[PDB]
Design a protein around this ligand. Structure first.
Ligand SMILES: [Ca+2]
Ligand SMILES: [Ca+2]
Ligand SMILES: [Ca+2]
Length: 199
């Protein structure tokens, strides 16, 4: 509580140990439900967190992604605050990262954002995420494939405009190809996503 302003102030500290300590403490608060998430937002954390998505330090990048994922695990208005802070262009670019850990974490944050209402889903679409998400359905990495399926399934839970955008990005044949997957969990998830898109 009382320590939140000092934590936020230190999210751009010139001392890297001080920055990382505040960032680690910040994600813990943002895990305590929507009221705590809102306290983090209202303390001004979002601009500093979005700036950290450009850090060359992959450790800081990962911790910033966790913090944003946790904020985006809240209500639709809390997701919208993440969107309004400009997180989506950086997240979409990180879908092309060669670091599988960073990629998984960027996908996680994007999927949480796409778990909001139709306005939050449409912002993900408008940020250009669909082509990369569809391409990731070809990934040999089970964890990445699982998260790309999750992201697309979340988007396909939106309105007809959102489902049609998923169709136009070529998701259908990629999900049909997964029906022959040896992995039953993936096959069933892909089939459910197909049904959502075609509904
Ligand atoms: Ca500061
Ligand atoms: Ca959610
Ligand atoms: Ca829905």
């Amino acid at each position: 509580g009382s320590e939140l302003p000092q934590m936020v102030q230190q999210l751009n500290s010139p001392d890297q140990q001080e920055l990382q300590s505040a960032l680690r403490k910040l994600s813990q608060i943002a895990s305590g439900g929507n009221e705590q998430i809102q306290a983090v937002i209202d303390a001004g954390a979002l601009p500093a967190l979005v700036q950290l998505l450009s850090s060359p330090n992959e450790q800081i990048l990962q911790e910033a992604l966790w913090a944003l994922s946790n904020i985006a695990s809240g209500g639709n208005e809390q997701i919208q605050a993440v969107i309004d802070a400009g997180a989506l262009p950086a997240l979409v670019q990180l879908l092309s990262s060669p670091n599988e850990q960073i990629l998984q974490e960027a996908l996680w944050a994007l999927s949480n954002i796409a778990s909001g209402g139709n306005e939050q889903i449409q912002a993900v679409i408008d940020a250009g995420a669909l082509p990369a998400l569809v391409q990731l359905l070809s990934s040999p990495n089970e964890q990445i494939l699982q998260e790309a399926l999750w992201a697309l399934s979340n988007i396909a839970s939106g309105g007809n405009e959102q489902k049609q955008a998923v169709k136009e990005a070529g998701a259908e044949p990629a999900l049909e190809q997964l029906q022959s997957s040896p992995n039953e969990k993936i096959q069933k998830e892909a089939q459910e996503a197909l049904e959502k898109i075609q509904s």
